[PDB]
C-alpha cells in the first residue's frame, strides 16, 4: 500500500506498540504523531507566556546583583571619581523603577533560565505522563499558577511577601502534598471540600486576572493605567508620555512632600496621547489575529499572534522594537542574533529555600497552589476522559491514578527546575480530538518541547505586547464557566461573584478564593444552623 | 364585609377607578397600595446611593468656591497677617486631596440638592408614568447611569473631561433625542443597532463597574487600593494608614523629584494594617445583612443594610462615625440633628450649560447615555410586561408607547433638576408580583417619595461604607446576564468579554461599549465580507 501504512503496522505490532496499547486503542503511530503535533501547536504559547511572566517575578535576582551607580548619569561608574561625585550603593529601590542595569541584566539571565526551565519541566511532565500513565496528555506550567506565582506570591521584581526561592519551596512542598494525597485517594475529598460556586467561579476569576495582566504595561499591551481619582483609566499612551508615582504627605495647606523610602511605581500614569502607543496597537493587531484563528478553529492561534507581534518587534529602529537603542537592548539583540543556543540553567535550577516555612504567607501560597492544582487537574483530566471516551460507568478512566501522580511529580520536578506548578493543559484535548489515545502523544509533545529548546534566543526576545493578547484570550476562554453558576440563587451568585471579582481586583487568586469561601460560609451559616437544629430536634 | 373591602369597591367603581382601569385589571385599591409600598421598599436604596454617587461628581461649584488658605495650617485665614505669612490663592488642586474646606462645603450643600433632585425626579417620573402610561412602574435615577455620570463623564470632583453643567445638557439632549425617536417609532430600530453580545454583556459590565466602585475608598467599603507594582491590591487598612501619591520624574540615578502641578490622589495606598479598617468591616456586616435579606426574599433588603451601617455610623466618637470631630463633621452632625428639613434646590436645579456641545467628549457621554437608556428601558419594560402578562401575541403591551415617552420625559425633567438620567427600575417587578397592574402603583410610589423628602438631613448623613455593599450587590444581580452569552462562540465571547471587562478596568461604560462594538465589528468583517461577495456573486 503506502510506506506510512507499513510504518504504522510495524510500530503497532512491535513491542513498543503493545506496551503503549496502540492496537487496543485504534491508533498506532501516525495518529499519535499528528495528535502530539496538534497539542504542541495549541499549547506552545506557554514557551513565551510562562517565561515572560515568571521573569517579571525577578527570579533569584536580589539587591546584590544591583551595581553601584555614579552621582550623575553622564559618567560611567568606573570614571566616577571627582569633586562632589560618589558611587550610590544600591538599596531595595534598585529593583524597581528606575531599574538598576545590573538587576535588569540579571533578570534577562533569569529569563533565559526560565525559558529552559519551562521547556525541561514540560518535557519531563509529558514523558512521565506518557510512560507511567499512558495518556495523550501534555503537561506544562499552568497559566493561573504562573500569574499567581509571579505577580502575587513573589510580586513584580520580588516585591511580594514571599521570596522567589521560598515560593519555589512552596511549590515543591505543594507537589509533594498533592502526590501524597493522590497516592491514598484523599484528592477527591479535598476537591469536594471547596464549595461548588467558588470552585466553578475560580476559573473565571483566574481568567479575569489573566486578562487584567494582559491589559497592563509591564505585563501586556497597556490600555489600563493608573488614575489619581478612579485608580484605573485608559492607558495606551506612548511610553514617552508615561510617568511614575511616589507616595507623598499631605497637610491642611497643600505642602505635598515626597515620602522618603517610598516605593516608586513604573510608568503607569498617562499625561497625554491616550490610545496612541504603537506597541498597544501592535498588540491589538496580534489580538485580532489570534481571535480570528480561534474563530476559524486554527490550531496554534496564539503561536501565530505571538510570532507576528514578535517578528514585527524584532526590527531594530522602530517604536514597537523589542531591542531599544540602549545597552540592555543591544545585549538583547546580540543574544537574539544567534538563532540557536544551548542555554544551561545557572541561577534557577535547585534554588529552593525552606527558610520561610514558618511565615503565614508561605502557607497561604502553598494552600492556594494546592487547591488550584487539585481543582484544575480534577476538572481537566475528567473532561479529557469524557473527550476520549475513557470514562466507564463507575466514572474512572483506568490510568487516572498514575495520571494524578504524574501531574504531582511533574509539579515537584518543575519546582526543582524553578518554575511555577505545571499541570495538564486543556489544550491536550486538541490532540485527543485528532485521535490521540496513548502516551505516544505525550512523548511527541515532549520531543517538540525538546526542539523548542535550542531556540532560547528566539524566545527571549518576545516583548510584553506579544505576551499581551494571549492573556486576554485565555481569560475569554476561561470565562465560559460562568454559565454553570446559578446566578438566580444569591447563596450561589454572591460567593461566585466575590471570587470572580476579587481575583482581578485584589490582584490575587488566593484573596479571591478566601473571600469566596468566606462569603459562602457566612451565607450558608443560617441554613447549616437550621439543619443542625432540625437534626438535634429543636426544630421541625 | 370588612371596612377595607368597602374602600376597594368604592374606589374601583368611582371615576378614578375607571380612569385607572382598576376593575378591568382585577385589583382596585389596596393591592395597588401594597404594590406601591413593595416597589418603594425594594427601590428606596436609590435615595441613599444616587445622591452619594452624584455628590462625588463635585456638583455645580468650581475652584471659585474654594476659600484661600493661610500658609500654615495652625492659623485661621482671618488671622493670616504676619511675617512670612500669606494667603494661598486656591487653584485646581483645591478640589482634590487635600480638599479645600470651601470646596468640601459644596459637596455637603450639593448633596442636599441632589437628595431633593433624586426625589423630585423620581416623584415626577412616577407620576408621569402612572398618569400618562397607566403602568405599575416606578422611575428613579438609574444605577446604570449614576456612576457613569459622576465618575466618568464629570469625574471625581469634576476631574473628568466634561463639566457637571455640560453633562446635564448631555442628559437633557439625550432625553429629548430619546423622546423624539420613541415618538416616531425608531427606538426599536436603534435598539437592534447594538450587537447582541455587546448588549447582553453591557449589563454585566456595568455591574462589575458598580461593584468595583463599591470596593473603592471614597466610593464604597475599601478593600481595593493602589499598588506600585500591580496598580490594585488589598486595601481596607485604617484611614490613618492611607497615604497619597503624586507624579514624579525618574532618572538614571533615583532622584525622584515631585512633578509640579501633578494631580495628587486621595488616600489609596495602604502602608500597614491591611484588613483592619473598622469601616470596611462595618460595610461587610451591612453586606451580610443585605445578602441574607436578599436570600430570604425580604423586600427592602438594601435599605436594612444601608440603615444598619448608617445608624452605627451616626454615633459621634467612634472609628466608623459619619461625623468626624472636625469642622465639616460638626456641620454634618448639626444638619443631621434636625431630623426633618424642607431643603430647596439652590445650585443644581436649572444648571444646564450648552457650551460644550462642540466637544467630542460631550457626544461620547450623550451617545452612551442614549444607548444605555435605550437598551435598559427596552429590556426592562418588556421584562415586567411578561410579569404582568400585558404582552399579547404581537409582543406589545398597549401602554408601551407612552411608557417610553414617560421614561424619556422624566429624563429631561431629571436633567433640569440636575440628576443622572432616570429610568424604569427592574425593582418595579416587585410591585407587579404583589399585584400592581395600574398607574396607582406608580402614584403610590411617588407619594412615598414625598415622605422621602423632609428627611434630607437623615439621608445626607449616609457614609461611603454604607453606599458600599449595595453597589457590590447590585453588581451581583446584574451579573446574571452572562448566561445568555454563547461563550463557546469566539465571535460572541470576545466582544462580550471586552465589553464586560473594559467597563471596570477602563472604569468607563462608554469605553466598554466602544471596545466591545469595535471588537464585534472587527471579528465579523470576514463573515460580512464573505457574505457580501456571495451576494455580489464572486463566491458560492
Ligand atoms: C504648609 O504647612 C506646613 C506645615 O504643616 C508648612 O511647614 C513646612 O513643612 C515642610 C515639611 O513638612 C518643611 O520642609 C517646610 O520647611 C515647612 N515650612 C515652614 C515655614 O515651616 C509649610 O510651610 C506650608 N506650605 C506652604 C506653601 O505654605
Ligand atoms: C542624578 O542625576 C540628576 C540629574 O540628572 C540629579 O538631579 C538633581 O536634582 C534636580 C533635578 O535635576 C536638579 O535641580 C539638580 O541640579 C540635580 N543635581 C545635579 C548635581 O545636577 C541628581 O543629583 C542625581 N542623583 C543623586 C542622588 O545625586
Ligand atoms: N493551568 C492550566 N490548566 C489547564 N490547562 C491550561 N492551559 C494553560 N494553563 C492551563
Ligand atoms: N438603571 C436601572 N435600570 C433598571 N433598574 C434599575 N434599578 C436601579 N438602577 C436601574
Curated annotation (Swiss-Prot), chains A, B:
It is found in: Membrane. One of its GO terms (cellular component) is cytosol. It comes from the Eukaryota. The chain crosses the membrane at residues 35-55, 114-134, 166-186, 204-224, 243-263, 275-295, 303-323, 362-382, 397-417, 442-462, 463-483, 497-517. Disruption phenotype: Resistance to 8-azaadenine and 8-azaguanine but not to other toxic nucleobase analogs. Deficiency in the uptake of adenine and guanine. Keywords: Membrane, Transmembrane, Transmembrane helix, Transport. Its main location: membrane. Belongs to the nucleobase:cation symporter-2 (NCS2) (TC 2.A.40) family. Azg-like subfamily. This is Adenine/guanine permease AZG1. It comes from Arabidopsis thaliana (Mouse-ear cress).
Amino acid at each position: 500500500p503506502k510506506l506510512l501504512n507499513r510504518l504504522n503496522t510495524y510500530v503497532g505490532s512491535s513491542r513498543v506498540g503493545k506496551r503503549f496499547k496502540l492496537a487496543e486503542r485504534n491508533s498506532t503511530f501516525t495518529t499519535e504523531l499528528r495528535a502530539g503535533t496538534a497539542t504542541f501547536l495549541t499549547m506552545a504559547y506557554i514557551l513565551a507566556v510562562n517565561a515572560s511572566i515568571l521573569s517579571d517575578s525577578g527570579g533569584t535576582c536580589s539587591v546584590s546583583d544591583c551595581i553601584p551607580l555614579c552621582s550623575n548619569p553622564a559618567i560611567e561608574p568606573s570614571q566616577c571619581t571627582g569633586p562632589g561625585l560618589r558611587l550610590i550603593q544600591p538599596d531595595v529601590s534598585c529593583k524597581f523603577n528606575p531599574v538598576n542595569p545590573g538587576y535588569a541584566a540579571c533578570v534577562e539571565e533569569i529569563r533565559k533560565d526560565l525559558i529552559v526551565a519551562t521547556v525541561a519541566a514540560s518535557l519531563i511532565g509529558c514523558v512521565i505522563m506518557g510512560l507511567m500513565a499512558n495518556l495523550p496528555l501534555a503537561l506544562a506550567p499552568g497559566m493561573g499558577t504562573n500569574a499567581y506565582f509571579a505577580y502575587t506570591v513573589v510580586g513584580f521584581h520580588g516585591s511580594g511577601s514571599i521570596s522567589y526561592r521560598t515560593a519555589l519551596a512552596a511549590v515543591f512542598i505543594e507537589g509533594l502534598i498533592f502526590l501524597f494525597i493522590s497516592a491514598i485517594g484523599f484528592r477527591a475529598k479535598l476537591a469536594k471540600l471547596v464549595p461548588k460556586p467558588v470552585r466553578i467561579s475560580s476559573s473565571a476569576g483566574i481568567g479575569l486576572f489573566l486578562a487584567f495582566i494582559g491589559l497592563q504595561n509591564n505585563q501586556g499591551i497597556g490600555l489600563v493605567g493608573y488614575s489619581p481619582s478612579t485608580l484605573v483609566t485608559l492607558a495606551a499612551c506612548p511610553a514617552s508620555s508615561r510617568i511614575s508615582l511616589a507616595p507623598v504627605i499631605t497637610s491642611a495647606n497643600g505642602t505635598v512632600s515626597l515620602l522618603a523610602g517610598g516605593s516608586v511605581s513604573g510608568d503607569i500614569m498617562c499625561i497625554h496621547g491616550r490610545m496612541e502607543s504603537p506597541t498597544f496597537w501592535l498588540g491589538i493587531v496580534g489580538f485580532v489575529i489570534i481571535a480570528y484563528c480561534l474563530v476559524k478553529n486554527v490550531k496554534g492561534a496564539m503561536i501565530y499572534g505571538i510570532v507576528f507581534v514578535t517578528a514585527v518587534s524584532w526590527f531594530r529602529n522602530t517604536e514597537v522594537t523589542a531591542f531599544p537603542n540602549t545597552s540592555a537592548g543591544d545585549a538583547a539583540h546580540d543574544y537574539f542574533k544567534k538563532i540557536v543556543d544551548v542555554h544551561v540553567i545557572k541561577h534557577t535550577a535547585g534554588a529552593l529555600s525552606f527558610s520561610g516555612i514558618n511565615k503565614g504567607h508561605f502557607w497561604e501560597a502553598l494552600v492556594t497552589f494546592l487547591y488550584v492544582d487539585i481543582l484544575d487537574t480534577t476538572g481537566t483530566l475528567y473532561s479529557m476522559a469524557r473527550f476520549a471516551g475513557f470514562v466507564d460507568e463507575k466514572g474512572d478512566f483506568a490510568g487516572q491514578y498514575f495520571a494524578f501522580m504524574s501531574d504531582a511529580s511533574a509539579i515537584v520536578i518543575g519546582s526543582l527546575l524553578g518554575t511555577s506548578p505545571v499541570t495538564v493543559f486543556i489544550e491536550s484535548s486538541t490532540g485527543i480530538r485528532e485521535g490521540g489515545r496513548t502516551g505516544l502523544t505525550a512523548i511527541t509533545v515532549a520531543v517538540y518541547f525538546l526542539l523548542a529548546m535550542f531556540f532560547t534566543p528566539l524566545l527571549a526576545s518576545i516583548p510584553a505586547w506579544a505576551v499581551g493578547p494571549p492573556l486576554i484570550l485565555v481569560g475569554v476562554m476561561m470565562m465560559k464557566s460562568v454559565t454553570e453558576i446559578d446566578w438566580e440563587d444569591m447563596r450561589e451568585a454572591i460567593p461566585a461573584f466575590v471570587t470572580m471579582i476579587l481575583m482581578p481586583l485584589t490582584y490575587s487568586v488566593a484573596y479571591g478564593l478566601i473571600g469566596g469561601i468566606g462569603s459562602y460560609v457566612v451565607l450558608h451559616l443560617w441554613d447549616w444552623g437550621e439543619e443542625g437544629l432540625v437534626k438535634l430536634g429543636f426544630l421541625k
